[PDB]
Amino acid sequence: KVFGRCELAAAMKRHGLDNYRGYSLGNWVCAAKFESNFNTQATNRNTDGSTDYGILQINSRWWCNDGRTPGSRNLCNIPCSALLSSDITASVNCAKKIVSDGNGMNAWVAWRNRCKGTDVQAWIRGCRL
Ligand SMILES: [Cl-]
Ligand SMILES: [Cl-]
Ligand SMILES: [Cl-]
């Protein structure tokens, strides 16, 4: 599924992400835009052999099991393929654990490089939330 901007903002808000650990909804929408272009099916391979999965490009090195990332952890206790669903629930619950980990949303490289310190409220402008 490729979410529309406001559609995803609403789904994210419903799943408790608005101001979760202090990060306004715009931050989350911005992150998803640059991580996956709002596509729940996005996968991308990393140089170390891990893979990033779904709307928030959650990494098999730490957070999910894909059975092909030697030495990795599965801290969200889910198969990586569950992060590719049209329903964002699994990605959101895992994202809550990631963002609580210590470095906040800096865990998402695209958030740090493209969203952090920007006018993130523009991502939710005009949306019915
Ligand atoms: Cl915002
Ligand atoms: Cl593995
Ligand atoms: Cl959803």
117 conformational bin, left if phi > 0, alpha if psi -120 to 50, beta if neither? left
Instruction: List phi, psi (to 5°) of 45.
Output: -90, 140
Distances (CA, A) of 33 to 30, 72, 73, 93, 100: 5, 26, 26, 18, 21
- Look at strands 43-45 and 58-59 and give their pairing: unpaired
Q: How far apart are CA 83 and CA 92, in angstroms?
A: 9
Residue whose pair of structure tokens reads 């006018």 in the numeric block: 119
DSSP 82: G
What's the 128 CA to ligand 2 centre distance in angstroms?
40
Cβ neighbours around 116 below 10 Å, total: 16
For 62, residues 6+ apart whose C-beta sits below 8 A from its C-beta are 72, 73, 75
Neighbours of 127 (CB within 10 A): 17
Domains of the chain: 1-129 (1.10.530.10)
Resolution (A): 1.8
**Which one is catalytic: 7, 18, 52, 119?**
52
Q: Give the closest ligand to the alpha carbon of residue 8.
A: 3
